[PDB]
RNA sequence: GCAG
C-alpha cells in the first residue's frame, strides 16, 4: 500500500491482474519537447538538429563563411508565475555561438585570415512547464499532438468514380515532408499520366526523359523481350515457356516434334510444364504474328544509313522485310501479355509529344512556369530543384523509411531527395498495381498517419525563421565590409524569433488551454488532431477520416471525440499509446510463447500488430499463463476471429487498453451506448470543481492516476515526516535516507491559493496531509481542484431516484431537492479578472480617481483614496471598483441644455466618467487588486501600497524559507555532532552558529562538517540574491502596451449556487437541466424519512441505452449501505474488533477479485482512520470492462442489509401515501457543468449598433441583440406576420430614423411603428453602384 | 509563341522585358552619343 | 475549442 492509500482504500472489484502499470499521461508533451530543447550531440534532434541543418553558411563566392559551434539557453527572465502576471512569454533566451571564417584572398585552399567568435543571441524559444503546458502571454497554452498522413509514397485508386464504366483508376502519390508533390496516375485509357504539385497532367513518360533515359532505355525498364531470331527461314522466335500462360494461340505449336496446342485452343499450366519438359525454346510461327508487335531497340541500316526502325515502333510485315534486308536477323521485341503485363509504357510513349531530355524539360517547364519562355539554362535548373536538391526537397527519414516499406526494399535509412530509381521503382509499383499484382495503401491505416508533436512543430517553426536568417546573412556576407564585423552584426532575431513567435501564440495547434477540472487539462494534453497546419480541414474533410479504423485500437480512443463539426478528427490517445521513434503510434501487448502468456510487453506498430493474431484482455488464463479455454477470441488482421491457443502470438495488456483516460473514468463503461459514453466522457470535462471536493463512491481506478499525472496536486518529492502544515505550505522534514549529503534536508510545498483558471473557476491547493504525519515519496500532500486525498472527484455523490416526478423532470431535466443547496454541494467558486486601463488620450490622459463626477458619494462609498476598490470589498452588479475620468471637448450644448444651465447655474464637468464596474448581475467580492504603471508615470497611494506589501512579502517569505531551511542544517548539524563527541549536556547551550566552525576528531565526520556549513554560508549567501532580485522585480516599472498609463486589475470571486437552469450531468451522458429546487419535505422519502436528493427521468434510460447509469445507481447503493453501516458502528462506539471484521468482511466480498485487503496487518489506528474515512459510503473500484458483476452487486447490496433488487418503496412527501411500484433510489455521481444559466442569460432592449451597417451588435458581451436569422425570417413569413416581420427588420434593427421614433412612441405610450428603409440596404445600394452598376429605386 | 498561357503581369512584363539584350561598356557610350 |  502507502499510507495515502491506507487512509481510505477503495474496494477494488475488478479481477484481471494487471501487469503494466499505467505510465506517465503527459508523456508526449514532455518527451516531444525534451527532444525539442535538449542538447543532442549525434544532432538529430531539435536545435541542434536545425542548426545543422542550415550552418554552414557560405558566401556566394565562399571567399567566408558563419558556421556554428554551440548553443546555450539562457535562464528566464520571470518564472512562471511571474509570466502568467505581468502578461509575458515564459521563455528562455536562445544564445548560439557562431564563427565568422575569413578566407584568404589568393591560396591554394582558401586558408584562414581570420576568426571571430562570439555568442550571439537569436530568439527567445518558449519553455514548456513541468506540466505540459507553455504561459505565452500570460494564458496557459497546449500545443496539440496533430496526425498527419505520414510522408512516403501512397498507392490509392479510385473505384470506378470516374467515366461511368466503373473502371478503377489507380494512382501513386509521392508526399515529402517538405517540397514539390509528385502524382503519377491512370487514365480510362490506360496511360500513365504525371503531375506536379497537383497541376495540369504531362504523360508520365516525360518525367522519365527529363532524367535522361532515351525512348530504348526506358522500354529497357519496364519491359522484357521476346527475341525474335532470323535463323535460316520462317522467323524463328526464342521461347520462354511461362509468357504463355493462359492464352488461346492463333496457331498450333510445333517445336522439333510433337503439336503441343492447335490452333484457337486455350493453353494451360499443363502446356507450360510439357514445353518445359521438352525444354522448348524455338517455335517457328506465322508470319502474322508481328502484326501488332512493337519492336524494343534502334533497328538501322548498314547499307543505306536509314533508320529502319526505331523503339516504339509497331511492326509490320513490310516492315519486317525491309527490316530484313540490311542483315538484321536479330530481332528484339516487347512481350506485352494482355492481363498480366499491359502496354501502359509503350502506350504513353506515343501520347507524350516529346523526343528528347530537352524538350521535356521544356514541357515541365511550360507546365510549371506558363507563358514564360523556357530557355535551357533555367528549365533543367527548374527540374533539379524540383525533386532533387536538398535546399528545397526533404523526403525526411520518415519518409524514406515507409518509401523503401512500401517499394519492399530493405534499406530504412538514405537520402531526403528522390532519385531516378525511387521514381522509377514508383512507377514499376503502380504498373505492377494495375496488373493486379499489388494492394493500394489504406490512407487511414494508422501506419500511414504519424503523430506530429510539440517539439517537432517547435523545430520546423525555428527551422523556418532559421532560413529566413540565412538567405539574409548569405546576402550580407557577399559585401566587402568583411573585415570589421562581427557574427552578431549580421544575425537579425526579430525573423527567427518571430517565427516561434507565431506558431505558439497564432497557430491552430496553439490552443488555450482547458482548464476546468484536473481531467480537462491532462486531455487537452493527449488530444490527437487531424487539424492543423499540414492537415486536414474541418469541413473538407470526408467521412472515412471520421470513421473509427481497425487500428485505432489501443492506440487512438474511439469513443472520446467531439460531436459537432469535427467529430472523428479531434481524437484522443489511448491510455497506454505510445509513439514510435518515426511518431507512428504503437501499443503494448504481452507475448505468448507456448500458450504461456508471458509479462514481457512489446510495444507494437499498427502495421505490426496486422502479422500476428492477438488474444483478448477478456481472454480467460489460470495463473500458469495458460489460456483455459482452447478457442480464443482474438484479432488477426483487423479482422476479429477465434483461434487456438497456440496460434495466438500476443495479448492485450489490460482491459481499458484501448480507451483513453477520460473514458477509463466511466463506471460500467461496458453497459454504455457509445453514443452515451461519448457523451459522458466529453462531459466529464466540463465540470467545474465544487466547494468541497467529493470522492466517487464508484469509480473506476483511475482516479488516483489522473490526479497525480496531472499537476494539480502536491505530491512530494522525498518522503519524510511533516514538519509544518498550514493552508499555505507544507514543510517536509526528509528521512535521512533520501537526503543528500550537504544538505538542510527539509522540503517547502508552497501552496496555490484562489487563483484563476482559464476557465474563471477557481485552483486552490488544500493541504492533505496533518501536522507530524509520515509521507513517502510520491504520495498527495495537497489537494488540488476537484481532487479528494489524491483522487479526482469532479461532482458529489447524490441520492437519486428514478421516477417520474409531477413533470418536474421532463425531456431531461433534473429536480434538485433544496438539502442540496442547503448544504452548498453544487456551489463553485468563479474568480473574474477585470482590467481599468488608463491610457494616454489625445485630448489628455484618463486618471485614475476618486473624484467622480455624476454620482453619488454613496457609490465611491468602497473606493479609497487612490481611486480604487478595497480589497474585500463585497461588491454587487453596477458598483465602481476603479474610478477613473477621461478628459473630454466639444461639448455643444443645445439651447435647452443651454438654458437648463443658465437657470440653475450647475455647470457641465470637463471630465467624462470612464470607470471600471461590476458587470451586471455578478455579485462577488474584490480578493486581488493589481496596479502596473509605465515607468515615468507617478504611483499613486495605492501602488506603493501595493508595492511595499509586496515588498513585505517577498522578504518575508525568503526570510521564512531560510528559517526553516537554517534550522533543517542545524538538526542535521546536531545528529553529527552527536554521532562522536556527544556534547548532548552542552550542545544546546551554545550559540548554534559556532556550531558551523566547531573543529571536531576529523575521522570522516568533520568532512560531512566542512559540507554542511559550505551549505549554511550558500544559504547565507543565496537568501540575499533572491532578496535582491525580488525586490528589483517589484518595484521595476512595468513595459505596458503603447499608449496604456496604468492598469488595475481587481479580481472578484463569485460564489455562484446551484439554481433551476444549470446544467448537471452524470458520467453516462445523462445530461439534464435543473428544472426546480423542491423543499425537502416534498422530495421522495423512504421509510426511515430520508429524503431523495434528485429525482431523475426514468424514461431516459430505455431509449438512449446508457444502463450502465442505472448499475452505478444500485452500486453506489451497496456502497453507502456499507458506509452507513460503519458509521452506525461509529456512534454506538464499538470496538475496533468489531469495525475491523465488519471492514474487513466488506474488502473481503467479490468472485475472484485482484485485491486483497488484509487488515490485520493495519493497527488499531489505522483501521480506526480508515473507518472515518469510509463512513460516507465505502468507494468501489469498477474498472472499464473489468467491473463489478451484477451478482457482486447484489452481493455487496445484501451485505449492506439493503433490498438486492436496488429499489426500495419510497413515499411521496407531499401527501404522505407511497408511490404504487418500488423506485431504483441509488447515490449516482452528478457532475455540475461548465455552462451555468447565470452565463447564459442576455437580454438588450436598445443598445450599442455596428458602425457600418446600423445593426445591433453581436454577442452578449457587447450587450448583444439576437440574430433574427433568415429561418426565422421564412417562420414569420409561413404564418401571416406581416407586422411582426417588417418590424424586426426596419425598427428593431436598422431603421436608424424608425428606431428612434419607435423608442420615443413606447414611452409616449403609442405602440406604432413609422418604418423607413434599413440602412443595410442603402449600404447594399451604395456598394452596388461603387460596381459601376447603376442600381436605382424608380419612383 | 508562348503568348496567351499567362494573365499574371509579372511573367508578361519579364517575359517582354527580356527580349531587350543588355548593353556593353561601350554600347551605352555611343548611345549616350547619340542622345 | 465548445453548446443544442
Ligand atoms: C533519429 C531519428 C530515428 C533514427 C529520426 C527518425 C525520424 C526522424 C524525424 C522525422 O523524420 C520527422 C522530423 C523531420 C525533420 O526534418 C527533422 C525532425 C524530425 C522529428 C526527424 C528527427 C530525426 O531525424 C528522426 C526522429
Ligand atoms: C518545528 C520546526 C522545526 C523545529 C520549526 C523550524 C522552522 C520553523 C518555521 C520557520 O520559523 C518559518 C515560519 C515562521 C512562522 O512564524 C511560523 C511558521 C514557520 C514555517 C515556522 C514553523 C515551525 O516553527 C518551524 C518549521
Ligand atoms: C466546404 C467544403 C466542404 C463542406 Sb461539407 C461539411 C459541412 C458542415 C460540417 C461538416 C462538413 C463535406 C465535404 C466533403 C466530405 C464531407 C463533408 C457538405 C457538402 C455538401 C452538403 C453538405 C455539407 C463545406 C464547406
Ligand atoms: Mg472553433
Known amino acids: ?1339 | 509563341s508562348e503568348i496567351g498561357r499567362t494573365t499574371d503581369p509579372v511573367r508578361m512584363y519579364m517575359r517582354e522585358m527580356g527580349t531587350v539584350e543588355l548593353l556593353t561598356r561601350e554600347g551605352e557610350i555611343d548611345i549616350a552619343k547619340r542622345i
Open chain 1, 1 to 1339: 500500500y502507502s499510507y495515502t492509500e491506507k487512509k481510505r482504500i477503495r474496494k477494488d472489484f475488478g479481477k484481471r491482474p494487471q501487469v503494466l502499470d499505467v505510465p506517465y499521461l503527459l508523456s508526449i508533451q514532455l518527451d516531444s519537447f525534451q527532444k525539442f530543447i535538449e542538447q543532442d550531440p549525434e544532432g538529430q534532434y531539435g536545435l541542434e538538429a536545425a542548426f545543422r541543418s542550415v550552418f554552414p553558411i557560405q558566401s556566394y563566392s565562399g571567399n567566408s563563411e558563419l558556421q556554428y559551434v554551440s548553443y546555450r539557453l539562457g535562464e528566464p527572465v520571470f518564472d512562471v508565475q511571474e509570466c502568467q502576471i505581468r502578461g509575458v512569454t515564459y521563455s528562455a533566451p536562445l544564445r548560439v555561438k557562431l564563427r565568422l571564417v575569413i578566407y584568404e584572398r589568393e591560396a591554394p585552399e582558401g586558408t584562414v585570415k581570420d576568426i571571430k567568435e562570439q555568442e550571439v543571441y537569436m530568439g527567445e524559444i518558449p519553455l514548456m512547464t513541468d506540466n505540459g503546458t507553455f504561459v505565452i502571454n500570460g494564458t496557459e497554452r497546449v500545443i496539440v499532438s496533430q496526425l498527419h498522413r505520414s510522408p512516403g509514397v501512397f498507392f490509392d485508386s479510385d473505384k470506378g468514380k470516374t467515366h461511368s464504366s466503373g473502371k478503377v483508376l489507380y494512382n501513386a502519390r509521392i508526399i515529402p515532408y517538405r517540397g514539390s508533390w509528385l502524382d503519377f496516375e491512370f487514365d480510362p485509357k490506360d496511360n500513365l499520366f504525371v503531375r506536379i504539385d497537383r497541376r495540369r497532367k504531362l504523360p508520365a513518360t516525360i518525367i522519365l526523359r527529363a532524367l535522361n533515359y532515351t525512348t530504348e532505355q526506358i522500354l529497357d525498364l519496364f519491359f522484357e523481350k521476346v527475341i525474335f531470331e532470323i535463323r535460316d527461314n520462317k522467323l524463328q522466335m526464342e521461347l520462354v515457356p511461362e509468357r504463355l500462360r493462359g492464352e488461346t494461340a492463333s496457331f498450333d505449336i510445333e517445336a522439333n516434334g510433337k503439336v503441343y496446342v492447335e490452333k484457337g485452343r486455350r493453353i494451360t499450366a499443363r502446356h507450360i510444364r510439357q514445353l518445359e519438359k521438352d525444354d522448348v525454346k524455338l517455335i517457328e510461327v506465322p508470319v502474322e504474328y508481328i502484326a501488332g508487335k512493337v519492336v524494343a531497340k534502334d533497328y538501322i541500316d548498314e547499307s543505306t544509313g536509314e533508320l529502319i526502325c526505331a523503339a516504339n515502333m509497331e511492326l509490320s510485315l513490310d516492315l519486317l522485310a525491309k527490316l530484313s534486308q540490311s542483315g538484321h536477323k536479330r530481332i528484339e521485341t516487347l512481350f506485352t501479355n494482355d492481363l498480366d503485363h499491359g502496354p501502359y509504357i509503350s502506350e504513353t510513349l506515343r501520347v507524350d509529344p516529346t523526343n528528347d531530355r530537352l524538350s521535356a524539360l521544356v514541357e515541365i517547364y511550360r507546365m510549371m512556369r506558363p507563358g514564360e519562355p523556357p530557355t535551357r539554362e533555367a528549365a533543367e535548373s527548374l527540374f533539379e530543384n524540383l525533386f532533387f536538391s536538398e535546399d528545397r526537397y526533404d523526403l525526411s527519414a520518415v519518409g524514406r523509411m515507409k518509401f523503401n516499406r512500401s517499394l519492399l526494399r530493405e534499406e530504412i535509412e538514405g537520402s531526403g531527395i528522390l532519385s531516378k530509381d525511387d521514381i522509377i521503382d514508383v512507377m514499376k509499383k503502380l504498373i505492377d498495381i494495375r496488373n493486379g499484382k499489388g494492394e493500394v495503401d489504406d490512407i487511414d491505416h494508422l501506419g500511414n498517419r504519424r503523430i506530429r508533436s510539440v517539439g517537432e512543430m517547435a523545430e520546423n517553426q525555428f527551422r523556418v525563421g532559421l532560413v529566413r536568417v540565412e538567405r539574409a546573412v548569405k546576402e550580407r556576407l557577399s559585401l566587402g565590409d568583411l573585415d570589421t564585423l562581427m557574427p552578431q552584426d549580421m544575425i537579425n532575431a526579430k525573423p527567427i524569433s518571430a517565427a516561434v513567435k507565431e506558431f505558439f501564440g497564432s497557430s491552430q495547434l496553439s490552443q488555450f488551454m482547458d482548464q476546468n477540472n484536473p481531467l480537462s487539462e491532462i486531455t487537452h494534453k493527449r488530444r490527437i488532431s487531424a487539424l492543423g497546419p499540414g492537415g486536414l480541414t474541418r469541413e473538407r474533410a470526408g467521412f472515412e477520416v471520421r470513421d473509427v479504423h481497425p487500428t485505432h485500437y489501443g492506440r487512438v480512443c474511439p469513443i472520446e471525440t467531439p460531436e459537432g463539426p469535427n467529430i472523428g478528427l479531434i481524437n484522443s490517445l489511448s491510455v497506454y499509446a505510445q509513439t514510435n521513434e518515426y511518431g507512428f503510434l504503437e501499443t503494448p501487448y504481452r507475448k505468448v510463447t507456448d500458450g504461456v502468456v508471458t509479462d514481457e510487453i512489446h510495444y507494437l506498430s499498427a502495421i505490426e500488430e496486422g502479422n500476428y493474431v492477438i488474444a483478448q484482455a477478456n481472454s480467460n488464463l489460470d495463473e500458469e499463463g495458460h489460456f483455459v479455454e482452447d478457442l480464443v477470441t482474438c484479432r488477426s488482421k483487423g479482422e476479429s476471429s477465434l483461434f487456438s491457443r497456440d496460434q495466438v502470438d500476443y495479448m492485450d495488456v489490460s482491459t481499458q487498453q484501448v480507451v483513453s483516460v477520460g473514458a477509463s473514468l466511466i463506471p460500467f463503461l461496458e453497459h454504455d451506448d457509445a453514443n452515451r459514453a461519448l457523451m459522458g466522457a466529453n462531459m466529464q470535462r466540463q465540470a467545474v470543481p465544487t466547494l468541497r471536493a467529493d470522492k466517487p463512491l464508484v469509480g473506476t481506478g483511475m482516479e488516483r492516476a489522473v490526479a497525480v499525472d496531472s499537476g494539480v496536486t502536491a505530491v512530494a518529492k522525498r518522503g519524510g515526516v511533516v514538519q509544518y502544515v498550514d493552508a499555505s505550505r507544507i514543510v517536509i522534514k526528509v528521512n535521512e535516507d533520501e537526503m543528500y549529503p550537504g544538505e538542510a534536508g527539509i522540503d517547502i510545498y508552497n501552496l496555490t491559493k484562489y487563483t484563476r483558471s482559464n476557465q474563471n473557476t477557481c485552483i486552490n491547493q488544500m493541504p492533505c496531509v496533518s501536522l507530524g504525519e509520515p509521507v513517502e515519496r510520491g504520495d498527495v500532500l495537497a489537494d488540488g481542484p476537484s481532487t479528494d486525498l489524491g483522487e479526482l472527484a469532479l461532482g458529489q455523490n447524490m441520492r437519486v431516484a428514478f421516477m417520474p416526478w409531477n413533470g418536474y423532470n421532463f425531456e431531461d431535466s433534473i429536480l434538485v431537492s433544496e438539502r442540496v443547496v442547503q448544504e452548498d454541494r453544487f456551489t463553485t467558486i468563479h474568480i473574474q479578472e477585470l482590467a481599468c486601463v488608463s491610457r494616454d488620450t489625445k485630448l489628455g490622459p484618463e486618471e485614475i480617481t476618486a473624484d467622480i463626477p455624476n454620482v453619488g458619494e454613496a457609490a465611491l462609498s468602497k473606493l479609497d483614496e487612490s481611486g480604487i476598490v478595497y480589497i474585500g470589498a463585497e461588491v454587487t452588479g453596477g458598483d465602481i471598483l476603479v474610478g477613473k475620468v477621461t478628459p473630454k471637448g466639444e461639448t455643444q450644448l443645445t439651447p435647452e441644455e443651454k438654458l437648463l444651465r443658465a437657470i440653475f447655474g450647475e455647470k457641465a464637468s470637463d471630465v467624462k466618467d470612464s470607470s471600471l464596474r461590476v458587470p451586471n448581475g455578478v455579485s462577488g467580492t474584490v480578493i486581488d487588486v493589481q496596479v502596473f504603471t509605465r515607468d515615468g508615470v507617478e504611483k499613486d497611494k495605492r501602488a506603493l501600497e501595493i508595492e511595499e506589501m509586496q515588498l513585505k512579502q517577498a522578504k518575508k517569505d525568503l526570510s521564512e524559507e531560510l528559517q526553516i531551511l537554517e534550522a533543517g542544517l542545524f538538526s542535521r548539524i546536531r545528529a553529527v555532532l552527536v554521532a562522536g563527541g556527544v556534547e548532548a549536556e552542552k550542545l544546546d547551550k551554545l550559540p548554534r552558529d559556532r556550531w558551523l566552525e566547531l573543529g571536531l576528531t576529523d575521522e570522516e565526520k568533520q568532512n560531512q562538517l566542512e559540507q554542511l556549513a559550505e551549505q549554511y554560508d550558500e544559504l547565507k549567501h543565496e537568501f540575499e540574491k533572491k532578496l535582491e532580485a525580488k525586490r528589483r522585480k517589484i518595484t521595476q516599472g512595468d513595459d505596458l502596451a503603447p499608449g496604456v498609463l496604468k492598469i488595475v486589475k481587481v479580481y472578484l470571486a463569485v460564489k455562484r449556487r446551484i439554481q433551476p437552469g444549470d446544467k448537471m450531468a452524470g458520467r453516462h451522458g445523462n445530461k439534464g437541466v435543473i428544472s426546480k429546487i423542491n423543499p425537502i419535505e416534498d422530495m421522495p422519502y423512504d421509510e426511515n424519512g430520508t429524503p431523495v436528493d434528485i429525482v431523475l427521468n426514468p424514461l431516459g434510460v430505455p431509449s438512449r441505452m446508457n444502463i450502465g447509469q442505472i448499475l452505478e445507481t444500485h452500486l453506489g447503493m451497496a456502497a453507502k449501505g456499507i458506509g452507513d453501516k460503519i458509521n452506525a458502528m461509529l456512534k454506538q462506539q464499538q470496538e475496533v474488533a468489531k469495525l475491523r471484521e465488519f471492514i474487513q468482511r466488506a474488502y473481503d466480498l467479490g468472485a475472484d477479485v485482484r485485491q486483497k485487503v488484509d487488515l490485520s496487518t493495519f493497527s488499531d489506528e489505522e483501521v480506526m482512520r480508515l473507518a472515518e474515512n469510509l463512513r460516507k459510503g465505502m468507494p468501489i473500484a469498477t474498472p472499464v470492462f473489468d467491473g463489478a458483476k451484477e451478482a457482486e452487486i447484489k452481493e455487496l447490496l445484501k451485505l449492506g442489509d439493503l433490498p438486492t433488487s436496488g429499489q426500495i418503496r419510497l413515499y411521496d412527501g407531499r401527501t404522505g401515501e407511497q408511490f404504487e411500484r418500488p423506485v431504483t433510489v441509488g447515490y449516482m455521481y452528478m457532475l455540475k457543468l461548465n455552462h451555468l444559466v447565470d452565463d447564459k442569460m442576455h437580454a438588450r432592449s436598445t443598445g450599442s449598433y455596428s458602425l457600418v451597417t446600423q445593426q445591433p451588435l453581436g454577442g452578449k458581451a457587447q450587450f448583444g441583440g439576437q440574430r433574427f436569422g433568415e429561418m426565422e425570417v421564412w417562420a414569420l413569413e409561413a404564418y401571416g406576420a406581416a407586422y411582426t416581420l417588417q418590424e424586426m427588420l426596419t425598427v428593431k434593427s436598422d431603421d436608424v430614423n424608425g428606431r428612434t421614433k419607435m423608442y420615443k412612441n413606447i414611452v409616449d405610450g403609442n405602440h406604432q411603428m413609422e418604418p423607413g428603409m434599413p440602412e443595410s440596404f442603402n449600404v447594399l445600394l451604395k456598394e452596388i453602384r461603387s460596381l459601376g452598376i447603376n442600381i436605382e429605386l424608380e419612383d
